[PDB]
RNA sequence: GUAAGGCGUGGGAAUCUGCCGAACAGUUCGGGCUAAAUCCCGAAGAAAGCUAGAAAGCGCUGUUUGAUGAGCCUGCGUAGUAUUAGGUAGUUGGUUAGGUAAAGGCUGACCAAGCCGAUGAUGCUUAGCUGGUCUUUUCGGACGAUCAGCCACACCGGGACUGAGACACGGCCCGGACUCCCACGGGGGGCAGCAGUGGGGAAUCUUGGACAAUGGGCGCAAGCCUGAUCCAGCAAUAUUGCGUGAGUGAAGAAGGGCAAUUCCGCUCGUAAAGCUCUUUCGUCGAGUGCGCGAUCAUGACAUGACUCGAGGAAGAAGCCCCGGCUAACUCCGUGCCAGCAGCCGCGGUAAAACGGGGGGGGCAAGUGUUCUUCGGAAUGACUAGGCGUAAAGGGCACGUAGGCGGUUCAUCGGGUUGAAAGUGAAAGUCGUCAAAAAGUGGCGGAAUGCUUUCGAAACCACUGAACUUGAGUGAGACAGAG
RNA sequence: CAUAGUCAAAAGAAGAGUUUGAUUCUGGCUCAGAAGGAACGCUAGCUAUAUGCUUAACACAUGCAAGUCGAACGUUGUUCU
């Protein structure tokens, strides 16, 4: 609504690690394991940012229903 | 071409050199002109037919050709006013107005041709609208032709314009063989430093200093001179009258205060006079809205348009048919 | 009316007939000519003015003018019939087109000549 | 096709909901399809297993939920026609059984005689509806083509099966017409998907490329499909685009037209040619490409674009009109003929009106003609018209519906009115900026409406108490070819 | 302080010819404007973006427009060590 709650209020974040995190195995077969375990621990973070966004909706819903 | 336009307008509407022939053509095309002026009272076409289809040709010829009627129609606005003032910020018309070019196809052939820049990226249309902040300029490789035309454009503009007609009322074929002379003096730096700077040119100046100053008295500034002094021309007659009755009721300080008193009411109280010269056509500056350094050339916008500064040569009684501005104000209205 | 009266029983357009039924609200037609003949004006004109008896592509029929001077048309040629009426002519209200099918442009025509079907003259 | 079982808008209760998100519990045992199973059957309580190659990862089942869809109902709004006045008989309602996921005459039986209709039912004709498109000083009119939302249909009729979902365009069964094979017993088919062909018509395109992008199906992925799409091709069909040069040039050349045959006689005309300059668009030759669309990677477009180079004003101007309306005039030919014409009108020997020459005007890669819509048209008039003599007061009343119509005080809160919340899809219109140079987008405004909540109380409606000025009675006087 | 502040949401209103010996009125016809999924004539250089069977829901040759999964399941048979 305001631009000082947006520039102080927002998570600035640093360089991402995972980019670039690949390394090459010897093994064909090894490597799809890796990709399919890389998919698994995506689908893992993918469900903590729902219940997170979850918690936060619920809580802007509680203090809308007390000003109501 | 061309020169048929102005038989179809009754006046030099074009802008090149004309022959003996088509200035004796001229004399009978403003014989015409001035006849139709005359016949004006019995005419029942003469305002919403004839008058505004001649403003409409001369308003297409002066912006280069343009479809006037055609574009303005593509709006639905009556007043041509905004439709003039957004015509001022195209970018062939703003580079005929800088004196960067002669002529609008001058123009739109080294816009169209990828030779101009704005804000130093080349822009090839010739439509596009500037508006306040644009930087104007040249190729590198090009410049220099146009420096050297820009300079030829205002030395021959004022040997061929301020020279042949103020003062030097010479006639054509005479003026025609004395120009040789003139274009001689203008071939190297130092003859245009020795013209600039020359007791000539300071005549023609201070002539034209009393003749822009005349034509002022058309609106009565001779009378708001008084007005702003009246009360020191009221002193001197109160001096007048005191003294030839003190120094009377008992001759240098009469004839004195009488020379003064004269010579005081001949000035503010002499009507404007009009005289048979013409007046020459002065070449504008559009320095209300375009700021130009003529050395590299390069030019920025920082205002805009006037409506009432527009150089076209079309009556104000006339031209009022289509812009229907309320005149006098200074805005554009 | 009054303004209840307007609500009960509105406003009705007003009936015209119209020009050219026959071309079924399309530019135009294709027919072939039954019969080739004159017909003279209404007066105070005279002349004998070059129609034809037109069998249209809906079956209608009709007749239509065949505009210029001379042309080529005889029985059971195709000709493109456009709207317009003939005032001379009471009952042609169409005319043929030249240049299109079986009627010929007019070759020598100068001045408004695409309305004759004749092609610019090729300069030597 | 459909005139209200649809659509627009707002609501509701008597329902279901695969995949997707989040909890909890389980995932046991026999038999059958030549062989097996996550296929089919049975028992408990419903099920189904695979993977130590995918071993705590998928999948299934039951129960609670969110989300998304779907079914059902309903208020209001949404053609013409009365030279169509009655329509209905499961019709309208009730009871009881059945059917459905679910309310319900949805339908079997029984009972009652209802229901709809002059506020237009029923009949007939036409029509998909909306957002919107064109036009227009607001309103309206015409249209509903592209695109998006909803509906309907899939050769013509009728059915159901499977399924979370269909009574299913490229599924099945039946009947019909047409059609192709047939070895003659019988089989097969459905472009209103994209291309394409006949046919009809005044008239409407390639039997193209790629799944690179976006979207979709299946798969754990790798991938595979995708005439969705993206992108090329054809067509002045449209678009406030760009170009066809910029200057100079008098032998005012030749040639054309006109001319007491006036001023270089006037004009084509500075027009051309010639000379100098610049090469957009198009042309030709090359070069880089994580320029960019696309990124972890993948580029159909792309023979493009971009950048550089070659060249030479070179390759690029028509159509209508010139009597008036309406800007623009002369000569020759013709002689009420030939012809022209939107209207008025022209042509019968000097035609500015027909046809050609010459000149000129308007628009311009267009410009005319026809069709069609709105405007001008206040020419169906709400905005904004009329009816003595021009179209138009019913022959005159009475009365049904409807419309319209006095005062005060009190109450109320349906209309009205103020605010808040929900909704009013996107695109389009309007404002503004940026982008772009015939191309895009963001944020607003608008969407004049409907629902809910809470205020106000003057007006309209409704309720109560009153008033007498409009209407109507009585008493007393009258007049009258009623 | 400031990636603040500014309160915009339109424009759009034109007349002319034609009834009479002439006039004013009534009243139609016609014209100048904008437009289309248009068609036709004459004439055409370029790029881009749109649009392109309105008629026969007429009949359709030919190719393509819906498949995918071996990580549900056996089955037979190919190679080689
Ligand atoms: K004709
Ligand atoms: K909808
Ligand atoms: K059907
Ligand atoms: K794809
Ligand atoms: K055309
Ligand atoms: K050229
Ligand atoms: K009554
Ligand atoms: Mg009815
Ligand atoms: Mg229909
Ligand atoms: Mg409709
Ligand atoms: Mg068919
Ligand atoms: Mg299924
Ligand atoms: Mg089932
Ligand atoms: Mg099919
Ligand atoms: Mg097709
Ligand atoms: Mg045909
Ligand atoms: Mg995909
Ligand atoms: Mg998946
Ligand atoms: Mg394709
Ligand atoms: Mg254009
Ligand atoms: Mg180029
Ligand atoms: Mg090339
Ligand atoms: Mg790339
Ligand atoms: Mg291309
Ligand atoms: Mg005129
Ligand atoms: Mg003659
Ligand atoms: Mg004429
Ligand atoms: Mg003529
Ligand atoms: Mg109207
Ligand atoms: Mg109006
Ligand atoms: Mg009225
Ligand atoms: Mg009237
Ligand atoms: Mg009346
Ligand atoms: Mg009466
Ligand atoms: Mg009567
Ligand atoms: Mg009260
Ligand atoms: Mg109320
Ligand atoms: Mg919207
Ligand atoms: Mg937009
Ligand atoms: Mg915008
Ligand atoms: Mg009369
Ligand atoms: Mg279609
Ligand atoms: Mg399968």
């Known amino acids: 609504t305001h631009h000082r709650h947006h520039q102080e209020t927002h998570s600035f974040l640093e360089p991402e690690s995972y980019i670039g995190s690949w390394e090459a195995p010897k093994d064909p077969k090894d490597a799809e394991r890796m990709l399919a375990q890389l998919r698994r621990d995506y689908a893992k973070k993918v469900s903590l940012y729902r219940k997170d966004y979850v918690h936060e909706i619920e809580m802007l819903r509680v203090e809308k229903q007390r000003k109501d | ?333 | 009316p009054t303004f209840n009266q307007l609500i009960r029983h509105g406003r009705e357009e007003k009936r015209r007939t119209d020009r050219t039924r026959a071309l079924d609200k399309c530019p135009q037609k294709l027919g072939a000519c039954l019969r080739v003949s004159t017909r003279t004006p209404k007066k105070p004109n005279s002349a004998l003015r070059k129609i034809a008896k037109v069998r249209l592509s809906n079956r209608h029929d009709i007749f239509a003018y065949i505009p210029g001077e001379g042309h080529n048309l005889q029985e059971h040629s195709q000709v493109l019939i456009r709207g317009g009426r003939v005032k001379d002519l009471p009952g042609v209200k169409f005319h043929c087109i030249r240049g299109v099918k079986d009627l010929m442009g007019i070759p020598g025509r100068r001045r408004g000549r695409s309305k004759y079907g004749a092609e610019k003259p090729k300069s030597i």
């Open chain 2, 1 to 333: 071409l061309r020169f048929q336009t102005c038989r179809l307008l009754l006046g030099n509407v074009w802008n090149r050199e004309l022959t003996i022939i088509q200035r004796r053509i001229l004399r009978r095309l403003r014989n015409r002109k001035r006849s139709i002026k005359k016949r004006k009272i019995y005419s029942k076409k003469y305002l919403t037919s004839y008058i505004q289809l001649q403003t409409t040709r001369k308003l297409s010829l002066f912006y280069g050709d343009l479809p006037i009627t055609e574009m303005h129609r593509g709006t639905k606005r009556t007043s041509y006013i905004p439709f003039l003032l957004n015509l001022e910020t195209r970018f062939d018309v703003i580079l005929l107005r800088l004196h960067f070019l002669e002529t609008i196809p001058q123009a739109r052939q080294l816009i169209s041709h990828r030779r101009v820049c704005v804000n130093k990226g080349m822009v090839s249309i010739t439509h596009l609208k500037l508006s306040h902040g644009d930087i104007i300029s040249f190729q590198e490789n090009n410049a220099i032709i146009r420096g050297e035309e820009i300079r030829r454009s205002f030395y021959k503009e004022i040997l061929v314009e301020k020279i042949i007609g103020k003062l030097l009322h010479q006639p054509l074929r005479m003026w025609r063989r004395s120009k040789t002379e003139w274009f001689h003096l203008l071939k190297t730096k130092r003859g245009c430093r020795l013209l600039l700077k020359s007791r000539f040119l300071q005549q023609l100046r201070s002539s034209m200093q009393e003749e822009d100053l005349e034509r002022t008295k058309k609106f009565g500034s001779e009378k708001v001179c008084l007005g702003s002094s009246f009360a020191e021309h009221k002193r001197m007659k109160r001096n007048l009258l005191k003294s030839l009755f003190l120094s009377k009721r008992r001759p240098i300080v009469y004839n004195s205060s009488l020379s003064l008193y004269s010579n005081s009411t001949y000035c503010f109280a002499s009507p404007h006079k009009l005289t048979m010269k013409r007046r020459i056509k002065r070449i504008e500056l559009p320095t209300h809205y375009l700021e130009v350094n003529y050395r590299t050339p390069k030019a920025v916008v920082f205002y805009g348009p006037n409506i009432g500064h527009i150089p076209h040569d079309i009556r104000l009684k006339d031209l009022n048919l289509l812009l229907w501005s309320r005149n006098g104000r200074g805005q554009n209205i």
